[PDB]
Amino acid sequence: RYLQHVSDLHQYAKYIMAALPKYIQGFSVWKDELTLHVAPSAVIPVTTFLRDNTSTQYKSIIDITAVDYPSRENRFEVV
Amino acid sequence: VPAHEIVSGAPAELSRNRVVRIYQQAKPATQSGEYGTFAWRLDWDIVDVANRWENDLIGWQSSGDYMQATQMKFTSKESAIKFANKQGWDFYIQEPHHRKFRVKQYANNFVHSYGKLKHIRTK
Amino acid sequence: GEHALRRYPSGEERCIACKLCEAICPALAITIDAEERIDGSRRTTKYDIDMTKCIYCGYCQESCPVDAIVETPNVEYATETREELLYNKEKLLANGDKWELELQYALDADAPYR
Amino acid sequence: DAYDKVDFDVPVGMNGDCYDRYLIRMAEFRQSLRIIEQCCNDMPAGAVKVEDFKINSPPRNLMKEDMEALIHHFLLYT
Amino acid sequence: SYPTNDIAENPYWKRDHRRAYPQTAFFDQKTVTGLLELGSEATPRIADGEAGTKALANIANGGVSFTQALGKSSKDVIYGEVLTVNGLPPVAPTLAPKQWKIIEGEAAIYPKGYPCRTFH
Amino acid sequence: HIVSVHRNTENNNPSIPFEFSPENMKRAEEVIAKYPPQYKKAAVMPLLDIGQRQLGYTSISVMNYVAKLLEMPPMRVYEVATFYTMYNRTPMGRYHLQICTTTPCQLCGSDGIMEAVQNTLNIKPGETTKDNLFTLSEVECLGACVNAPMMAINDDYYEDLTPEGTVKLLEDCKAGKMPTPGPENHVRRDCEPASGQKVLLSKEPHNVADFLQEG
Amino acid sequence: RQYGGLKDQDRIFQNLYDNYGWDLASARKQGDWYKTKELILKGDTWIIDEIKKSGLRGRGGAGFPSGLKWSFMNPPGWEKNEGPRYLVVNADEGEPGTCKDREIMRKDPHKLVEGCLLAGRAMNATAAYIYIRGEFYNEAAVLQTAINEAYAAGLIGKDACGSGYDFDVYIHRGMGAYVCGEETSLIESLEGKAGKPRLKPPFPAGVGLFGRPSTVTNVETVAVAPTILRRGGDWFASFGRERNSGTKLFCISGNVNEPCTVEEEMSIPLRELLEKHCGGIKGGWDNLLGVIPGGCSVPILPKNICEDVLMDFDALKDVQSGLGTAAVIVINKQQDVIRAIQRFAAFYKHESCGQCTPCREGTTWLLKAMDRFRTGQAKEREIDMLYELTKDIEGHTICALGDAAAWPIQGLIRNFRPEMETRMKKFHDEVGAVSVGGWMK
Amino acid sequence: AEIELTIDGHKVSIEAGSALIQACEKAGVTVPRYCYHDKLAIAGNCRMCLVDVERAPKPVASCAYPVAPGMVVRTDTERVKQARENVMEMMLQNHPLDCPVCDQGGECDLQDQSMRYGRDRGRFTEITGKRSTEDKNIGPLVKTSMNRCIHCTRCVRFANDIAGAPELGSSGRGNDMQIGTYLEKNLNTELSGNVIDLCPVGALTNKPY
Ligand SMILES: Cc1cc2nc3c(=O)[nH]c(=O)nc-3n(C[C@H](O)[C@H](O)[C@H](O)COP(=O)(O)O)c2cc1C
Ligand code: SF4
Ligand code: SF4
Ligand code: SF4
Ligand code: SF4
Ligand code: SF4
Ligand code: FES
Ligand code: FES
Incomplete structure (x- = not known):
C-alpha cells in the first residue's frame, strides 16, 4: 500500500507542476509529505489553484512559518 | 552591500564596538574524526571586563557579555562573509590549515639499509 | 520531591564526579566543581542545585550510574528566602542522611521497573 | 499509535453553534471511556521502549555489567 | 522481550532502521523535462548508450525547455505519465482512505431530537 | 604466565656486573660473523642463549650487556627476550622439567606422568624445588608426538614413559650421576614401530645412479 | 590404481630408521651429492621447469x-x-x-x-x-x-x-x-x-x-x-591423484596401538593406512571417535566419514578439512573430545603472538568458553554463540593462526553437538541451573 | 604518476603506491580506524579498516593495502558491516568499565566509534572476568592507566620514530602483552607530553592536573 501510495503522490505532484509551469520551480517528496517549491511573486496564483481546483482543493490554512538559513542570499524561507 | 544593522533591531554597540571572527573549526588532535570541520563558525572575540567573573555566594561563572554562547554555522566562506558585512560587523577570516599529502607504504617499514641502520623498528 | 545525595553503607559519599547529571538537566540547575585527591578516587569539591530553576524531571536520577542523587518524596519544604533555596553539597548530604530508609525502600520497590 | 487497532465512533454535529460543540464534547467523554475499556482488555505483553540503545537508554541492570551499554548510556546522555 | 537481546544471531544492521532512511526526492524544473523526454527506468526511450549521455547532457545543461517538452510530447506520454490513463487529472491522494458509516438507530449515542450524530 | 614486568630487588640489577667468558666471547664473535655487517642486531637471539649458558638464567645484566655489545637500545633486546618462552628470566635449579601436556601426550597418558612426578616432589608446575635441583614446567608440544608420552631435561628429551618407570628417572637425576643415554627405556630405536620394523627391511641401499632422469 | 603400499625402491628417504648411517660417506652410498655439478651447471630455468612438471x-x-x-x-x-x-x-x-x-x-x-x-x-x-x-x-x-x-x-x-x-x-x-x-x-x-x-x-x-x-x-x-x-x-x-602428486611422510600418533612415522603415497585410504602401519586402533575400528589429519589446526573427521576418505588435499578439502602436515591423531572412543579441543584452545592462547586484536582477544575468549563448556556450565544456545565467535575470529587476522584457532571449534560444533549437550545435561542434573556466562540461579 | 579507481561508486585519482585509506580519505568515504595516523608508520594491529575489495578473498586492511589500478572498493558490504561489528566486539571484552572516571569522556575515539559501527549488546558475562594488567610509573608528566589500553602500538611507534626516545616497547606475547618500559624507568624526551593526545583511549593522560 504505502509504497504504491508514495509512488502515487509523486505522480500527482508531477501533474501539479505540468499544469502550472510558469510558477512551480520544484517539488520534493519525503515519506507521504509533499512540498511545492515556489517563487515569492508566485504565491498568490498557486494558492488560488490550491484552493479552487476540484482535484486540488485545500480550503484551510493550518500553520505557516519561516525558517532562516543565514548561509543563503535569500535568507528566510516561508513555508 | 545594503547596511542591515539599522533594521535587525540590534543595538549600535554590537556593530561599532565588537570584532567577530570567521573560522573553520580545526580537526581535534585527540580523536581522529573530522565531521565538525566543514562548516564555517562565526564567533565573537571576547570583551575585556564583561567576559566572566566569579560569584561571591557559590562561585557561579556570571557573565555580562551576551554573545558569549552564540555561534553560527555557514556552508561557505563567501556566504559567511556576505552575511558578516551585510549586518555591518568587523570580521577576521582565519584561513584553514590542512594536512600535506605524503605517500605511505607499508613496505617503507623495512628496507635494506646499506650503511648504519640508524633506527630499529619495533611494530 | 526534594533532592538528596545518597551514601554507601559503611559511610561513603557515592558521587564520583562523573558529570552526567549536569550534562542532562533541561534547565541547567546542576553546577559541579570536581577535584581529585591523592587517593586516586574522584569526588566533588562543590555540588550545587539551584531550586529556583530545577524543574523536577527526574532525569538527574536517571543518568547517574552509581545511583548517588535521587528524588526524596518530600514536598513540605517551602522556604522564606531564595538563599535558603540554593542547595549546596552539605544540605543535600543532610537530605540523604535523614531520608534514607524510606528512600532505600522506594528505590528497591522501583528497581524492577527501571 | 494503535488508534487503528481499536474500535471507535466519532460524533459530528449539525449546526455550527456553541451547543453542538458542547454536545460533541459530552459525546467524546463516552467514546474515550470506550477506548479505555478496549485498551484494558486488548493489552499485550511486550517491550515498552524501542529495542536499540543508540536512541534510548539501557536498563540500569545491565548498564553496569556490559561494557557497551555503559558506553551507550554515557553517549546518550552527554 | 527476548528476541531483541538474544546472544546467537543478532547483527545490529539487520534490525537497523535509522540508517536505512529515505531521501527527499527533489525534482528540478529540468529533471522533469528529463522524465518527459529521456523516459524512465521503467519505460526508457534511449538507445545508443554512448550517444545516450550526449542526448542527456544538453538537457542537463539547459538545451530544451519544459514548455517545449510539453509541446513535443505525444498524447501517449501525456496520458501515461502526466495525466491518468483515462485522460483525467489525478486526485489529491490519501494514505489510508476513510469510508464513513452513519449510525442511526438505538446504537446511536443521542436519540432523534438531539442534533449530534455519531458517524463511524 | 609470561610475566613481563621486572622486579628490581636483588640479584637482578644493572649494577651487578657481567662479562663473557673468553670461550664464550670467541663464540659470540663467530656467531656475529654469520650475518651481514650492517645487521649485527640480528644476532640478538642466539647470543642471550650464550648468556643463558654462562649464567644460569637471563638476568637484566646480560640483556643490558648484549644491548651494549650490538649497538642497540636496551628495549629492543628487552622485547626479544620477553617474546620468547625459552629465555627463563627467573632463577631455576639445575634440572628443568619440561613435561608435555598437548593432546597427543594426553591421549596416551601424560596426566599419569605429571602426577607421578609431582607426587615424588611436592611442588607446583611453576614452582622449583627447595633443594634447587628440579624445576617443574608444563610445556606444550616439544615435537615428540609419536613418542607419545615424553618430557625433557635441559636439552635431552626423555620419551615413551610409564608412570612407574618415570619416578625411577626422577630419583636417578636426584641422586647425581644417573642420566639415561638420551632415548627412552630401550623399547625401540628412534621412531620405529614397537613390534618391529615393518618396512625398509633391506641390508643395503639401492643407488640413485642407476635411476637417473637423463636430461 | 590402488593407492598405497609402495615398494622399497620407491622411497625417497632411506635413512628414516638408523640403518644406512647419516655420514657424508654413508650418504654417498645412499646416493647423495652424486651428480651435483651437472645440476648446478644447468640453469635455473630447467630446474624450475622440472619442479613444475612434478606437481x-x-x-x-x-x-x-x-x-x-x-x-x-x-x-x-x-x-x-x-x-x-x-x-x-x-x-x-x-x-x-x-x-x-x-x-x-x-x-x-x-x-x-x-x-x-x-x-x-x-x-x-x-x-x-x-x-x-x-x-x-x-x-x-x-x-x-x-x-x-x-x-x-x-x-x-x-x-x-x-x-x-x-x-x-x-x-x-x-x-x-x-x-x-x-x-x-x-x-x-x-x-x-x-x-x-x-x-x-x-x-x-x-x-x-x-x-x-x-x-x-x-x-x-x-x-x-x-x-x-x-x-x-x-x-x-x-603417485597420488592428478593434482595431488607424489609421496609424504606420515606421523600417526595419538591412541593407536603402535604410533609410528612412515613415508608413503598420497591419495590413500585412511583405514588401509591405519591397518598397514599402526596395527589397528587400540580396541578395533569400533574404537574410533574421531581422527585429525594434520596438526591440531584441522577440524575432526567423524566416524562414518573417515572410512572411505583419501589422504590427499582434494578429498579432505571436499569434507571441509585440511591435510595439514598429515599428522594423524585418532581419538579413543573411551576418551573426551572436549578435553582434546580445550587443550587446543589453551595451546593457541599460549602460542598466539598477540599482534592483532581479534586473534589475541579471541583465543582468550575461546579458552574461557571451552573451560565453561567442558564442565557444562552453559545454556544450549552458547555453543552456536561459540560458532558465531569462531566466525568472528576466522577471516580477519594477519597470519593464519586465528584461522587455525577457528577450525577445531568448527569441527567440534559440526560433529559433536550431542556430546556437548549430554555433558551439559549432566551438569544440569548434578547441580542447579545456570545462566548465561556460567552464572548460577 | 596518478591512478584512477572506484570507491563507493565515486571515482578518485591518487598518486601511485599510496595506501587505500588515503584514497578513502580523498574520496570523502568515512573509514573507521584505531592504529592509523597521518604522521606515523603503518601497522595493521587494530583491524578496524577492513574493506570489501573485488578480486580479494578476505576483507583487506585498508591502511596497508596499496593502491592498484582498476580498483573497485566497496565499504557498505554487509560483510564489511558484519566485520566492523565483529572487530569492535572483540575490542570491548576486557576493556574496563571506566567511562564515568575516564579522562576521555566526550573525546574517546573508541567510544564514538562503538556507536556508528559497534554492536548494541555485549555477551561478555563470564565469571572469571576481566584481565587486569596492573600499571606502572612513567614520569611526572604522563598519567598511566594501562588497563584501558587496546595495544594500538601508536605510542611506541611515536617514541621510536619521531621523538627519538626508544625506551617504550611492547613486552609479552598474547594476553600478557604490556606497553611501556618495564625497568620502571623514566620516559625522557623533550616532546613527551604528546603521547597523551595521540593514544586513542584514556590510557596515557595528564598527570600534573
Ligand atoms: C601459525 C602458523 C604456524 C606455522 N608453522 C609451520 C611449521 O611449523 N613447519 C612448516 O613447515 N610450515 C608452518 N607454517 C606454514 C608456513 O607458512 C609455510 O612455511 C609456508 O606457508 C609454505 O611453505 P611451503 O611451500 O614449504 O609449504 C605455519 C603457518 C602458520 C600461519
Ligand atoms: S530533576 Fe531535572 S531539573 Fe532537577 S536537577 Fe534533575 S535533571 Fe535537573
Ligand atoms: S550525582 Fe551522578 S551524575 Fe552527578 S556527579 Fe554524582 S555520579 Fe555523576
Ligand atoms: S593471528 Fe597471529 S599475528 Fe594475528 S594476533 Fe594472532 S598470533 Fe598475532
Ligand atoms: S577510553 Fe575506554 S574506558 Fe575510557 S571513556 Fe573511552 S571507551 Fe570508556
Ligand atoms: S599506550 Fe595508548 S597509544 Fe600506546 S598502544 Fe596503548 S592505548 Fe595505544
Ligand atoms: S604432542 Fe607432546 S610433544 Fe608433540
Ligand atoms: S588502522 Fe588499518 S588496520 Fe589498524
Whole structure:
C-alpha cells in the first residue's frame, strides 16, 4: 500500500507542476509529505489553484512559518 | 552591500564596538574524526571586563557579555562573509590549515639499509 | 520531591564526579566543581542545585550510574528566602542522611521497573 | 499509535453553534471511556521502549555489567 | 522481550532502521523535462548508450525547455505519465482512505431530537 | 604466565656486573660473523642463549650487556627476550622439567606422568624445588608426538614413559650421576614401530645412479 | 590404481630408521651429492621447469605448488637489485602431531644441505639460513656437524662443487615460539626483532628478509628437491591423484596401538593406512571417535566419514578439512573430545603472538568458553554463540593462526553437538541451573 | 604518476603506491580506524579498516593495502558491516568499565566509534572476568592507566620514530602483552607530553592536573 501510495503522490505532484509551469520551480517528496517549491511573486496564483481546483482543493490554512538559513542570499524561507 | 544593522533591531554597540571572527573549526588532535570541520563558525572575540567573573555566594561563572554562547554555522566562506558585512560587523577570516599529502607504504617499514641502520623498528 | 545525595553503607559519599547529571538537566540547575585527591578516587569539591530553576524531571536520577542523587518524596519544604533555596553539597548530604530508609525502600520497590 | 487497532465512533454535529460543540464534547467523554475499556482488555505483553540503545537508554541492570551499554548510556546522555 | 537481546544471531544492521532512511526526492524544473523526454527506468526511450549521455547532457545543461517538452510530447506520454490513463487529472491522494458509516438507530449515542450524530 | 614486568630487588640489577667468558666471547664473535655487517642486531637471539649458558638464567645484566655489545637500545633486546618462552628470566635449579601436556601426550597418558612426578616432589608446575635441583614446567608440544608420552631435561628429551618407570628417572637425576643415554627405556630405536620394523627391511641401499632422469 | 603400499625402491628417504648411517660417506652410498655439478651447471630455468612438471605441492601445511612459488623469485628484471638474495628453510615444525623436522634432520641432514644448494641455485640465491626450533639442541649439534662435513669436503661454501657458484648455509635457532613457524614471523625473527608476523602485500619474494628478496620453504619440500632432480619428474608425478602428486611422510600418533612415522603415497585410504602401519586402533575400528589429519589446526573427521576418505588435499578439502602436515591423531572412543579441543584452545592462547586484536582477544575468549563448556556450565544456545565467535575470529587476522584457532571449534560444533549437550545435561542434573556466562540461579 | 579507481561508486585519482585509506580519505568515504595516523608508520594491529575489495578473498586492511589500478572498493558490504561489528566486539571484552572516571569522556575515539559501527549488546558475562594488567610509573608528566589500553602500538611507534626516545616497547606475547618500559624507568624526551593526545583511549593522560 504505502509504497504504491508514495509512488502515487509523486505522480500527482508531477501533474501539479505540468499544469502550472510558469510558477512551480520544484517539488520534493519525503515519506507521504509533499512540498511545492515556489517563487515569492508566485504565491498568490498557486494558492488560488490550491484552493479552487476540484482535484486540488485545500480550503484551510493550518500553520505557516519561516525558517532562516543565514548561509543563503535569500535568507528566510516561508513555508 | 545594503547596511542591515539599522533594521535587525540590534543595538549600535554590537556593530561599532565588537570584532567577530570567521573560522573553520580545526580537526581535534585527540580523536581522529573530522565531521565538525566543514562548516564555517562565526564567533565573537571576547570583551575585556564583561567576559566572566566569579560569584561571591557559590562561585557561579556570571557573565555580562551576551554573545558569549552564540555561534553560527555557514556552508561557505563567501556566504559567511556576505552575511558578516551585510549586518555591518568587523570580521577576521582565519584561513584553514590542512594536512600535506605524503605517500605511505607499508613496505617503507623495512628496507635494506646499506650503511648504519640508524633506527630499529619495533611494530 | 526534594533532592538528596545518597551514601554507601559503611559511610561513603557515592558521587564520583562523573558529570552526567549536569550534562542532562533541561534547565541547567546542576553546577559541579570536581577535584581529585591523592587517593586516586574522584569526588566533588562543590555540588550545587539551584531550586529556583530545577524543574523536577527526574532525569538527574536517571543518568547517574552509581545511583548517588535521587528524588526524596518530600514536598513540605517551602522556604522564606531564595538563599535558603540554593542547595549546596552539605544540605543535600543532610537530605540523604535523614531520608534514607524510606528512600532505600522506594528505590528497591522501583528497581524492577527501571 | 494503535488508534487503528481499536474500535471507535466519532460524533459530528449539525449546526455550527456553541451547543453542538458542547454536545460533541459530552459525546467524546463516552467514546474515550470506550477506548479505555478496549485498551484494558486488548493489552499485550511486550517491550515498552524501542529495542536499540543508540536512541534510548539501557536498563540500569545491565548498564553496569556490559561494557557497551555503559558506553551507550554515557553517549546518550552527554 | 527476548528476541531483541538474544546472544546467537543478532547483527545490529539487520534490525537497523535509522540508517536505512529515505531521501527527499527533489525534482528540478529540468529533471522533469528529463522524465518527459529521456523516459524512465521503467519505460526508457534511449538507445545508443554512448550517444545516450550526449542526448542527456544538453538537457542537463539547459538545451530544451519544459514548455517545449510539453509541446513535443505525444498524447501517449501525456496520458501515461502526466495525466491518468483515462485522460483525467489525478486526485489529491490519501494514505489510508476513510469510508464513513452513519449510525442511526438505538446504537446511536443521542436519540432523534438531539442534533449530534455519531458517524463511524 | 609470561610475566613481563621486572622486579628490581636483588640479584637482578644493572649494577651487578657481567662479562663473557673468553670461550664464550670467541663464540659470540663467530656467531656475529654469520650475518651481514650492517645487521649485527640480528644476532640478538642466539647470543642471550650464550648468556643463558654462562649464567644460569637471563638476568637484566646480560640483556643490558648484549644491548651494549650490538649497538642497540636496551628495549629492543628487552622485547626479544620477553617474546620468547625459552629465555627463563627467573632463577631455576639445575634440572628443568619440561613435561608435555598437548593432546597427543594426553591421549596416551601424560596426566599419569605429571602426577607421578609431582607426587615424588611436592611442588607446583611453576614452582622449583627447595633443594634447587628440579624445576617443574608444563610445556606444550616439544615435537615428540609419536613418542607419545615424553618430557625433557635441559636439552635431552626423555620419551615413551610409564608412570612407574618415570619416578625411577626422577630419583636417578636426584641422586647425581644417573642420566639415561638420551632415548627412552630401550623399547625401540628412534621412531620405529614397537613390534618391529615393518618396512625398509633391506641390508643395503639401492643407488640413485642407476635411476637417473637423463636430461 | 590402488593407492598405497609402495615398494622399497620407491622411497625417497632411506635413512628414516638408523640403518644406512647419516655420514657424508654413508650418504654417498645412499646416493647423495652424486651428480651435483651437472645440476648446478644447468640453469635455473630447467630446474624450475622440472619442479613444475612434478606437481610438488607445499609440504608445510599451506599446500602451494612449489614450482610456481620458486617462479615468483624471478621477475624479468631480477638482476638490477644487485645485492645478496637467498632462501629460508622452515625447519621449525612444532605442530601438535608432527615429528618430521626431527626425522629429516636427526636422520638425513645431507639431503637437506644439498636441497638447500640445489634449490638456491633455482632461486639465484646467494646464501641460505636454516631456522631450527630451539628446543632441538641435540639436532642442532647434529646438523652443524653435517654442514661442517659438507664444508670440509668442499661441496659448499665459496666454491660449491667446482661450479663457480658460492652458497653459505648457516643455522639459526629460535628459542621457543610457535608463531615463528609462519613465514613472515620467521622473517622478522631472523631479522632479530620480536617474532611477530607482518601483513601480506609486501610479499617475501618482492621485499623480504633484511629487505632483500627471500622466500620460505619447509624442510620436506626442500629435502625432496635433490632426489626429485636426480630422479625423473614424471616418475614423481605417477603417485597420488592428478593434482595431488607424489609421496609424504606420515606421523600417526595419538591412541593407536603402535604410533609410528612412515613415508608413503598420497591419495590413500585412511583405514588401509591405519591397518598397514599402526596395527589397528587400540580396541578395533569400533574404537574410533574421531581422527585429525594434520596438526591440531584441522577440524575432526567423524566416524562414518573417515572410512572411505583419501589422504590427499582434494578429498579432505571436499569434507571441509585440511591435510595439514598429515599428522594423524585418532581419538579413543573411551576418551573426551572436549578435553582434546580445550587443550587446543589453551595451546593457541599460549602460542598466539598477540599482534592483532581479534586473534589475541579471541583465543582468550575461546579458552574461557571451552573451560565453561567442558564442565557444562552453559545454556544450549552458547555453543552456536561459540560458532558465531569462531566466525568472528576466522577471516580477519594477519597470519593464519586465528584461522587455525577457528577450525577445531568448527569441527567440534559440526560433529559433536550431542556430546556437548549430554555433558551439559549432566551438569544440569548434578547441580542447579545456570545462566548465561556460567552464572548460577 | 596518478591512478584512477572506484570507491563507493565515486571515482578518485591518487598518486601511485599510496595506501587505500588515503584514497578513502580523498574520496570523502568515512573509514573507521584505531592504529592509523597521518604522521606515523603503518601497522595493521587494530583491524578496524577492513574493506570489501573485488578480486580479494578476505576483507583487506585498508591502511596497508596499496593502491592498484582498476580498483573497485566497496565499504557498505554487509560483510564489511558484519566485520566492523565483529572487530569492535572483540575490542570491548576486557576493556574496563571506566567511562564515568575516564579522562576521555566526550573525546574517546573508541567510544564514538562503538556507536556508528559497534554492536548494541555485549555477551561478555563470564565469571572469571576481566584481565587486569596492573600499571606502572612513567614520569611526572604522563598519567598511566594501562588497563584501558587496546595495544594500538601508536605510542611506541611515536617514541621510536619521531621523538627519538626508544625506551617504550611492547613486552609479552598474547594476553600478557604490556606497553611501556618495564625497568620502571623514566620516559625522557623533550616532546613527551604528546603521547597523551595521540593514544586513542584514556590510557596515557595528564598527570600534573
Ligand atoms: C601459525 C602458523 C604456524 C606455522 N608453522 C609451520 C611449521 O611449523 N613447519 C612448516 O613447515 N610450515 C608452518 N607454517 C606454514 C608456513 O607458512 C609455510 O612455511 C609456508 O606457508 C609454505 O611453505 P611451503 O611451500 O614449504 O609449504 C605455519 C603457518 C602458520 C600461519
Ligand atoms: S530533576 Fe531535572 S531539573 Fe532537577 S536537577 Fe534533575 S535533571 Fe535537573
Ligand atoms: S550525582 Fe551522578 S551524575 Fe552527578 S556527579 Fe554524582 S555520579 Fe555523576
Ligand atoms: S593471528 Fe594472532 S598470533 Fe597471529 S599475528 Fe594475528 S594476533 Fe598475532
Ligand atoms: S577510553 Fe575506554 S574506558 Fe575510557 S571513556 Fe573511552 S571507551 Fe570508556
Ligand atoms: S599506550 Fe595508548 S597509544 Fe600506546 S598502544 Fe596503548 S592505548 Fe595505544
Ligand atoms: S604432542 Fe607432546 S610433544 Fe608433540
Ligand atoms: S588502522 Fe588499518 S588496520 Fe589498524
